[PDB]
């Protein structure tokens, strides 16, 4: 009978407070919301997931010794250009990245998966500039 | 020098895309105020012999 495939719809804006939430145990979910696997009319090639505003990213909670033991990492393309920055220091300067880098590596690779990442808005909050979109609050 | 040489035939696409800057630009021209003919600015108009705005050149 051919399978459903939806015509385009209005994307639902969602609000989430991090704060005390385990990084990535949270990120996991944001990812799902991004893809829209929570919507029963989900399509793989389409990008119909929610726009996800997270607020209070600075107050993400982490297990173990990772504050000073997880190291984020960037390579320029120069000799010795491997940059190693510890979690601590990441929170210390660009906190909204920590959750940003986590959600991304949980998104598919490819054109679309970069599209969905754009739909992630992260603010070491609270307060996000998206009063315009009226994001429905979500729990976990 | 050890006689360097193309490894692969350049594809038609890759070829022509070299030539995306090969296109000519038309001669820039203005009307000569006297005789009205088109000519390159800052030249003498070879049609009437005039430049600013006198006879310069017996044509």
């Amino acid at each position: 009978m051919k399978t459903y495939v939806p015509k385009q719809v209005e994307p639902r804006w969602v609000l989430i407070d991090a704060e005390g939430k385990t990084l990535g145990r949270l990120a996991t979910k944001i990812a799902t919301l991004l893809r829209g696997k929570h919507r029963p009319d989900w399509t793989p090639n389409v990008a119909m997931g929610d726009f996800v505003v997270v607020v209070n990213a600075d107050k993400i909670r982490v297990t173990g010794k990772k504050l000073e033991q997880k190291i984020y990492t960037r390579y320029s393309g120069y000799p010795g250009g491997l940059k190693k920055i510890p979690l601590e220091k990441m929170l210390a300067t660009h906190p909204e990245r920590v959750l940003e880098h986590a959600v991304k590596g949980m998104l598919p690779k490819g054109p679309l998966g970069r599209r969905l990442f754009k739909r992630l808005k992260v603010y070491a909050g609270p307060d996000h500039p998206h009063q315009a979109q009226r994001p429905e609050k979500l729990e976990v | 020098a050890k006689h360097p040489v193309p490894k692969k035939k350049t594809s038609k696409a890759r070829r022509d895309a070299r030539r995306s800057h090969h296109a000519l630009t038309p001669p820039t021209l203005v009307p000569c105020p006297e005789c009205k003919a088109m000519k390159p600015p800052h030249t003498v108009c070879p049609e009437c012999g005039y430049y600013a705005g006198r006879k310069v050149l017996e044509v």
Partner: protein, 116 residues
């Protein structure tokens, strides 16, 4: 007598070349190149035919799973429920239900928590 190639080869070549229309550059211009893509096109169409049957099922199961967590339980439970219920509506149609006829699916969900 002599049977010169004559007409035969050109024809076997066009057959292939017509089969190769669409392909990038020489793959649609050069017979040989045509043949090599077509071989690959060959297996891919076979391999992906078999694969299409399991691409849709994974999709159905995604789509169903979502609809299932709307009513407060998971795909794996739900499916167990059906089997216990004795409901064998394939998940092609399970999917459709979940997206066209919410209510019926919601019926199916209850029979499923029921039989559990």
């Amino acid at each position: 007598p002599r049977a010169k190639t004559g007409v035969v080869r050109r024809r076997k070549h066009k057959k292939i070349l017509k089969l190769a229309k669409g392909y990038w550059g020489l793959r649609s211009k050069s017979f040989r190149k045509a043949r090599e893509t077509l071989f690959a096109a060959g297996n891919y169409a076979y391999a992906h035919r078999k694969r299409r049957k399991r691409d849709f099922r994974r999709l159905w199961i995604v789509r169903i799973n979502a609809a299932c967590r709307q009513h407060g339980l998971n795909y794996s439970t739900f499916i167990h429920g059906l089997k216990k219920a004795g409901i064998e509506v394939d998940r092609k149609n399970l999917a459709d239900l979940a997206v066209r006829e919410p209510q019926v699916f919601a019926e199916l969900v209850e029979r499923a928590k029921a039989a559990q």
